[PDB]
Symmetry: C2
Subunit: 310 residues, 2 copies
């Protein structure tokens, strides 16, 4: 039976699985009232990708497809409808058992990035790129139906019928009108439809335990704020688990966060079969620990194992 | 000790180590006249990172630092100086034995992206939160003001005023501004990391085939353009996932060359074989330039270490 392992990457060698950002800090928030059910960065410990999770760091919150035409919308700016394909360019099949094309954003907000186009016709093709926003809460955000809408400040220089890429950069705003909520899923098929094929929600099941996240701070195009995106496992863990596909020998792996410059354990955590961490902590905020620390798998344990308090 | 391995990732599950892009195609160009000496995506088969290579996909062609002031420049646009730190926020020590801060671009061109800032000072009237701004920006890596090894670079914006001095600044790369004649895109020309007239140091070595009939094999990605005509590409010697894997495993190299097979897992047939050299690059026996037309679910599998007499089957 192939032994389970994690990569040996310090926090400073890890990236977020929910937006293309480095991991900045570990984080807890035991008083969170929302259901935690993100769809990117979801992988079981035996290597089964779930939700909208895919392997490419460049695929997270990215889209590929083609602009169809300019459209009108109450949002400020100039608006464009885009069909979306799979990230690899093949047509997205809405009958596949996924919530939306892999890589689709898994949160409500105004995602800021760059739309770029390289024309099919040429002898070299013409190109353009412009800043763009995708409001994932909009009724026109229908990636599971194969099309979305983005806005630009640019008033006309977006071509219809030409290959189009969205490169995410950050958020447009976090003011009240921009509806940023990292735990609110988009409605992938539109306003009044039920999302399907979701990766399950995650939660601690033992008193005294809370979720532990890998937190990244996300850029803003304007306004005030210090927004963050919390993932359950970094993208390199998704990639590693997918590769190894080690059988899970219990429902809970005990892992130790170790300072290698001393071999000392700073704290311990439970890494659950569905791909998330809990710790024994009764406070919210960052975990203050050196970023050369890393998680080391020590043994499979019973669900009723009591974690040493942080 | 540890057997050598490569990850099991198809072409469509790989990303470029020299720019944040998926791998699009395998590619050869036997007649290339330039010295191939890129500095990102450089890792020996026993896991030694070289050049300016680091592990984060988000770090490739990224910068972190602080805008110091607006500056004068003869070229069109508004120009800004920024100091750069290490990507982890610690001060860059110019005496370290690297060519430049890890992640620094390794080619000549106008790199297009977004500069974003999150202020250090917070506003009580805004909930004790900082002000933010982001704008499109271009970094001309051939400019005499591109001096990352000295701890600072210059970028240009279309925006004429709304970039703040003294505030934390991030550059997120997106593509190239142009590949017209005046934009000096050449993927094999290194920047002068310490400026005009200085010699670059601590470089990862150049790579080349040493056997007749062999040419380098690259993992090629097409890079976006802000404007103009072109279909520019960036070729890396190994994808970022291979850098990450080799660094983790640190498997001893048992010869100078690992024979690898590009396999189609559906049929289990080998499509071609290649030499994976100790310093971290591939060669194939091919006498043409252009893409390697193969399924994107194919992948390289380590076969065995080979000696200096092994001749590759032609593609
Ligand atoms: C705080 C400043 O933000 C930018 O100011 C621009 C301003 O941004 C607003 C956002 O667009 C809006 O969603 C909300 O978040 O409030 C922001 C202002 O607080 O938008 C106007 C146009 O309406 C201008 O573009 C302002 O420049 C940034 O540009 C400033 O430097 C400040 O950081
Ligand atoms: C940072 C420099 O930017 C350009 O020169 C600008 C010049 O910078 C001066 C600094 O302000 C000063 O602290 C000291 O370092 O001398 C610098 C060079 O004179 O400031 C003027 C102000 O009008 C212009 O903005 C210059 O463009 C660049 O040319 C230099 O090489 C430095 O990188
Ligand atoms: C081919 C068209 O490119 C863009 O046109 C914009 C134009 O881009 C020029 C680049 O700035 C220049 O480096 C060189 O590459 O030529 C390009 C034009 O071919 O720049 C002007 C401003 O000077 C306008 O912004 C043009 O719109 C693109 O916007 C067009 O849709 C075409 O693809």
């Amino acid at each position: 039976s192939k032994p389970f392992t994690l990569p040996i990457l310090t926090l400073g060698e890890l990236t977020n699985s929910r937006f293309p950002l480095p991991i900045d800090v570990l984080y807890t928030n035991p008083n969170e009232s929302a259901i935690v059910q993100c769809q990117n960065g979801r992988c079981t410990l035996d290597g089964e990708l779930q939700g909208t999770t895919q392997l490419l760091p460049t695929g997270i919150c990215a889209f590929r497809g083609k602009v169809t035409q300019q459209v009108q919308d109450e949002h400020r700016g100039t608006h464009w409808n885009m069909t979306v394909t799979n990230l690899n360019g093949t047509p997205f099949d809405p009958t596949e058992d996924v919530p939306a094309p892999l890589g689709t954003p898994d949160f409500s907000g105004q995602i800021y990035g760059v739309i770029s186009q390289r024309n099919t016709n040429t002898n070299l093709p013409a190109n353009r790129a412009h800043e763009a926003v995708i409001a994932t809460y909009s009724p026109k955000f229908t990636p599971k139906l194969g099309n979305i809408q983005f806005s630009t400040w640019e008033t006309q220089d977006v071509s219809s019928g030409q290959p189009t890429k969205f490169t995410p950069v950050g958020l447009a705003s976090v003011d009240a009108n921009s509806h940023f909520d990292q735990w609110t899923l988009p409605s992938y098929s539109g306003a009044l439809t039920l999302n399907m094929n979701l990766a399950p929600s995650v939660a601690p099941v033992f008193p005294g335990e809370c979720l532990l996240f890998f937190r990244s701070f996300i850029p803003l195009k304007g306004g005030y704020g210090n927004p963050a995106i919390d993932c359950l496992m970094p993208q390199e863990w998704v990639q590693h688990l997918y590769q190894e596909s080690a059988p899970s020998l219990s429902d809970v792996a005990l892992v130790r966060y170790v300072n290698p410059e001393t071999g000392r354990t700073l704290f311990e955590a439970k890494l659950h079969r569905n791909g998330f961490l809990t710790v024994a902590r009764n406070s919210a905020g960052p975990v203050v620990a050196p970023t050369n620390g890393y998680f080391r798998f020590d043994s499979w344990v019973n669900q009723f194992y009591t974690l040493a308090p942080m």
